[PDB]
Amino acid sequence: MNLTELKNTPVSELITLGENMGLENLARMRKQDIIFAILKQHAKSGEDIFGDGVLEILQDGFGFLRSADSSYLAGPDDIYVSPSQIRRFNLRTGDTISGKIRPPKEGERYFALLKVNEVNFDKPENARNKILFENLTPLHANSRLRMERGNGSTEDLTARVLDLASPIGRGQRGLIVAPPKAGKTMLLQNIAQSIAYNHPDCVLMVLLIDERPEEVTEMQRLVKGEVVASTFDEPASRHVQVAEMVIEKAKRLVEHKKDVIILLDSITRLARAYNTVVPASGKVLTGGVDANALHRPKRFFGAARNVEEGGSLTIIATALIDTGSKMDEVIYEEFKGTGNMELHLSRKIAEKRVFPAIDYNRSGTRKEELLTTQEELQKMWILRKIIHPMGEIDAMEFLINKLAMTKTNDDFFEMMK
Amino acid sequence: MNLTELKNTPVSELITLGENMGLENLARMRKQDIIFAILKQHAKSGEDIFGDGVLEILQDGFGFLRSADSSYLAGPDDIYVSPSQIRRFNLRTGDTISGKIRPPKEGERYFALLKVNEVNFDKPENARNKILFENLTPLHANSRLRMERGNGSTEDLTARVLDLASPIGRGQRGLIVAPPKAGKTMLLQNIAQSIAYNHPDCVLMVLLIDERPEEVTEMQRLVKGEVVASTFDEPASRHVQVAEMVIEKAKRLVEHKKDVIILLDSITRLARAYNTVVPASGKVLTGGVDANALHRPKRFFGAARNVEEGGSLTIIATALIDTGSKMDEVIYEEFKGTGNMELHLSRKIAEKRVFPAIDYNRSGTRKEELLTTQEELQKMWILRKIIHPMGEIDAMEFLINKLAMTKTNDDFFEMMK
Amino acid sequence: MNKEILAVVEAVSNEKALPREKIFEALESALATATKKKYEQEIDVRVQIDRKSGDFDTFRRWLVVDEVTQPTKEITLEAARYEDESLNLGDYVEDQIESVTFDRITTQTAKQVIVQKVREAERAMVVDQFREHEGEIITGVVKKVNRDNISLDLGNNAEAVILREDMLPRENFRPGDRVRGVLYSVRPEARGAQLFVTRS
Amino acid sequence: HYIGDLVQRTEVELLKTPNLGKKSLTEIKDVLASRGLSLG
Amino acid sequence: TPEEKLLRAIFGEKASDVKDSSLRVPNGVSGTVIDVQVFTRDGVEKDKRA
RNA sequence: CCGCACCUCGGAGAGGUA
């Protein structure tokens, strides 16, 4: 009787089960109260109760096992983790803990954890003895993540243009610079779909912080993966906590030799949240940015790196420019000198309804020879030297007319010769 | 029993030693705690422990011996230096202290210094009587540091072009002005390799500040020397502290008649860090720079000079221009009128994959007759008069075609006449 | 982090009353006095805090001396032997740090110390203004008659003292009498400097 | 083990050994401030 | 001085001339507390024990 | 705690005990 399985069932089936068990009227009771009552009734018979969740250690020492479907929102009905077990098993924030639980006794408000059975969806013996992420030797992007579908679909044109302009690999740290109303949503959805289709082994993560609830419920019902979000109706502390939980889970997965790909579309929103929640230091920089406000997002961005011992962490954030606020401009100018990949989008091309409106001239990738072969690099260099003299709109039209003739870029490369 | 020897050992051997000694489980423990427990168990027998590190005197009076492997960062295993020991030997920040140490006893948290054995890689008797760096008579560069190796490798072309454009000597103070994506990393690596090969007596120090971790791990595993780095994940205060530690160590080494060379590609980043960590004074100049923000980097830059009594302090830094931020432009315009050597690089030539893309016309060296002979100066003047009429790309192509004819510059100069 | 004292040292300061260092010195002296008055047979306890986020720690110190006088605050040279006897006589700072004891009632004497140091800073400002407008013979009223020293009064929160050696050997002063004297130097007396006046 | 053996020797003699720590010396000083033990 | 009360109102730190007037137990008498009652005037906010 | 935004410690009455 897992907690997640009981939380995923609809309210109707829960009310039906509660009426069959013979409890009080559950129609006017909350779903969480129904779950609590049915867990008490099931434990009264003598059966054991099991649960799971990601650990969220508080400042006082203890922590809880939050759920992913609620963006790790603080709730009164979760698995309490005593500091004793934390000191015993050396648990940290982000460790996925699964084990036996029990209903709280009189005077308690949370489910107590007795014994942990599975750590990070793996054996506890392999999770206790491990090399920390701070000790992993970083490296440049070595493996290639080919975003091209190859099925000849019209949606694959965006992935083809992306692979021709900025090849992305495992451990890449890129930036998607674009003005508002450029098409970042559809482009990010296409990137997520291509990652889920071509690279299913990669752990795709979408973190939409401080966005509209309609866009959140659209993203959750469109892509095949995990979508942890935090709308603007929640305070900035919620955003900070969600980002911390996500980066801790990503670090734990990378330590467990997993290829995590994080698509962030709120780096500017996260920086604003950090600048809002930071105490008044007394020194304000140009644009209303605090001195210690850019530390946390810059570290979150730099966390992405390629691991030689195993696994990789790829983070492709999306920047916001020309938003009318000088603070966002200062944030973009500061974060520009940090990454090594910029995917610019042109508003002039977007106004002509030419999607995708990708600035091919200003795009590029540093050390691209480590992700492409010699002949592929030579062909890309020749294509750039031929395209550069033409204008942005003309270059995009030429590229679309050339890619529309065939399905794969290999045929275009063979015909160019 | 040395601190650095036990610190350089891998985790496996330390865990094995701890398990053989019969202590608590060392698998779920940090390396520092393992070393601490091993040192405690070894001192309980009665043997002496030794350590080393550069001294960092705090404002309260006490000091700490920071380690080199941690890039001079505050760690739990730092060696506590009481103010009494500083008053006995008249110690200062930067003085390397290699001597007998003891583990922290009951109530203590840092290793204590019992007896100092070596000061600045020399006897304390020779260090107690020394001439300060401020007393050394400054002079122009006299000893020539020929970057050209003479072996004939294709990497030596950059050093040859640098020697033919702007010769560098002991204590030279120059700036490598280059826009982003100009090829500063490869040029700095080539300079470091040439210095290591031709002049192995010159202490090479590659100080990285606010750089990428991939570039850091690439630099560390490529050059043969000491590499002190501080990625952007650290705040500006840590950057300033690391820069101060490095410059104090360099000054204390130069005071012992040593040839120290610092390759810091962070002059603009260091200026930004100083402007960020400086308290607000209410007077902001053009570019968002405080009136006293540039004083510290100006003095750091001007500290480089040639010493006639012995030793030299060479600082070759790379600058950034056309970065889209007017602050960097103001910083470059202020730092241009301070030094006596400017190495400008062209982005137009760099886009054509023509290396080295060095602005030969704008380059030059003040008082270059003290590092080159009369005939060499005449040949350089003739080369300048021949190159000046041609365009930048044309001059680069001419120089490449001329250097491809021979292996060394001497044969080229002999055949030109 | 102790946000309570942080907000105070950040807000109340910067108004020429707290120079960001004398305020911290007064606060640590007040905490030391509170800890001294807390214990019964344990005197001479000090505390040093010179950081915003960094909290304060109470490290009770002993007086390094080769004698046994004041056995409650005296230590021997064998404790300094760990530092190879570098701790010369006359300087007393070394010991293990102990448990700190903070309380809201300790602010009573802390506020008194703070306002006393503010009055001392205002006295220093009056001294500076007097130096800015010095160069004339002044008159003052004596308050007390101590051994080899007297006092002067100019009611602008100012005060002055005259050394007895500089005065006439026959003339003895009494409170309420006006005294003519030109000041020439201010020696840094303990707990605030005082304007020294001389007649000879 | 007993306090009498430690009180038989002066605090200077106890401080002349590396077996004693900073916390132990502070506790001994706090115990001796009450004039109950460690009085030479 | 009316400036010190402004500082007392700026921070939550207590500062006043505190005199002890607590209810103590008379000499000789003893016992075990079996009941405690608290009566508060209208308008005044109640405390934790009340 | 004064203003957010980068060009060259008492009196009366009632009851009781010896």
Swiss-Prot record, chains A, B:
Residues 61-66, 78-80, 108-110 are annotated as: RNA-binding 1. GO terms for cellular component: cytosol; membrane. PROSITE patterns: RHO_RNA_BD. It holds the Pfam family Rho_RNA_bind. GO terms for biological process: DNA-templated transcription termination. ATP binds at G169, R170, G171, Q172, R173, G174, K181, A182, G183, K184, T185, M186, R212. This is Transcription termination factor Rho. It comes from Escherichia coli (strain K12).
Curated annotation (Swiss-Prot), chain C:
Residues 1-137 are annotated as: N-terminal domain (NTD) interacts with RNAP. It comes from the Bacteria. Residues 135-200 form the S1 motif domain. It is found in: Cytoplasm. Induction: In response to low temperature. Negatively autoregulated. Induced by cold shock (42 to 15 degrees Celsius) (at protein level). Disruption phenotype: Mutants are sensitive to DNA-damaging agents. Monomer. Binds directly to the core enzyme of the DNA-dependent RNA polymerase (RNAP). Interacts with nascent RNA. Interacts with the termination Rho factor. Interacts with the phage lambda N protein. Interacts with SuhB via the AR2 domain, crystallizes as a 2:1 SuhB:NusA heterotrimer. The rRNA transcription and antitermination complex (rrnTAC) consists of RNAP, NusA, NusB, NusE (rpsJ), NusG, SubB, ribosomal protein S4, DNA and precursor rRNA; S4 is more flexible than other subunits. NusG and the alpha-CTD of RNAP interact with the AR2 domain. Belongs to the NusA family. This is Transcription termination/antitermination protein NusA. It comes from Escherichia coli (strain K12). The lineage of its organism: Bacteria, Pseudomonadati, Pseudomonadota, Gammaproteobacteria, Enterobacterales. The gene is nusA.
Swiss-Prot record, chain D:
Acetylated on Lys-22 and Lys-23 in the presence of glucose. PatZ controls acetylation of Lys-23 but not of Lys-22. The modification N6-acetyllysine is found at K22, K23. It comes from the Bacteria. DNA-dependent RNA polymerase (RNAP) catalyzes the transcription of DNA into RNA using the four ribonucleoside triphosphates as substrates. This subunit plays an important role in subunit assembly since its dimerization is the first step in the sequential assembly of subunits to form the holoenzyme. Part of the processive rRNA transcription and antitermination complex (rrnTAC). The complex forms an RNA-chaperone ring around the RNA exit tunnel of RNAP. It supports rapid transcription and antitermination of rRNA operons, cotranscriptional rRNA folding, and annealing of distal rRNA regions to allow correct ribosome biogenesis. Belongs to the RNA polymerase alpha chain family. The N-terminal domain is essential for RNAP assembly and basal transcription, whereas the C-terminal domain is involved in interaction with transcriptional regulators (such as CRP) and with upstream promoter elements. This is DNA-directed RNA polymerase subunit alpha. It comes from Escherichia coli (strain K12).
Curated annotation (Swiss-Prot), chain E:
Acetylated on several lysine residues in the presence of glucose. Coiled coil: none annotated. It comes from the Bacteria. Co-administration of salinamide and rifampicin or salinamide and myxopyronin suppresses the emergence of resistance to both antibiotics. DNA-dependent RNA polymerase (RNAP) catalyzes the transcription of DNA into RNA using the four ribonucleoside triphosphates as substrates. Resistance to the antibiotics salinamide A, salinamide B, rifampicin, streptolydigin, CBR703, myxopyronin, and lipiarmycin can result from mutations in this protein. The RNAP catalytic core consists of 2 alpha, 1 beta, 1 beta' and 1 omega subunit. When a sigma factor is associated with the core the holoenzyme is formed, which can initiate transcription. The rRNA transcription and antitermination complex (rrnTAC) consists of RNAP, NusA, NusB, NusE (rpsJ), NusG, SubB, ribosomal protein S4, DNA and precursor rRNA; S4 is more flexible than other subunits. In pull-down experiments interacts with CedA. (Microbial infection) Interacts (via flap domain) with Escherichia phage lambda antitermination protein Q; this interaction renders bacterial RNAP resistant to transcription pausing and allows it to read through termination signals. Belongs to the RNA polymerase beta chain family. The gene is rpoB.
